[PDB]
Amino acid sequence: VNSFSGYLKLTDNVYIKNADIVEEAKKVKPTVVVNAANVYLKHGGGVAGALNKATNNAMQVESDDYIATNGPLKVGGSCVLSGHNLAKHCLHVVGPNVNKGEDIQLLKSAYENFNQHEVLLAPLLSAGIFGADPIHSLRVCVDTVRTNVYLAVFDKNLYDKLVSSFL
Ligand X SMILES: CC[C@@H](O)[C@H]1CCCN1c1ncnc2[nH]ccc12
Applying the rule CB under 5 A, the residues between 113 and 152 that interact with Cl ion are 128
Say how far apart CA 96 and CA 137 lie, in whole Å. 11
Q: Which of ligand X, Cl ion, none does residue 120 bind (CB under 5 to 8 Å by kind)? A: none
Separation CA 3–CA 99 (nearest Å):
36
Minimum gap (Å) between residue 1 Cβ and Cl ion: 31
Binding to ligand X, residues 80-139 (CB under 6 A): 123-124, 127-128, 134
Q: How far is the CB of 122 from ligand X (least distance, A)?
A: 9
Angle formed by the axes of helices 134-144 and 156-165, nearest 10° = 60
CB of 152 to ligand X, least distance (A): 5
Neighbours of 74 (CB within 10 A): 12
Positions in 88-117 near Cl ion (CB under 5 A): none
Q: Are 19 and 153 in contact (CB under 8 A)?
A: yes
Smallest distance, ligand X to C-beta of residue 121, A: 10
Q: How far is the CB of 11 from ligand X (least distance, A)?
A: 18
Choose the binding region for Cl ion from 9-17, 36-44, 101-109, 143-151 (rule: CB under 5 A): 36-44
Residue 84, SS3 per DSSP: coil
Choose among 117, 111, 87: nearest CA to 24. Answer: 87
Under rule CB under 6 A, which residues in 5-44 are in contact with ligand X?
Answer: 20-22
How far CA 149 is from CA of 4, 64, 100, 112, in Å, comes to: 11, 28, 27, 12
Give the nearer residue to ligand X in terms of CB position, either 106 or 152. Answer: 152
The residues that touch ligand X, with contacts defined as CB under 6 A, are: 20-22, 46-47, 50, 123-124, 127-128, 134, 152-154, 158
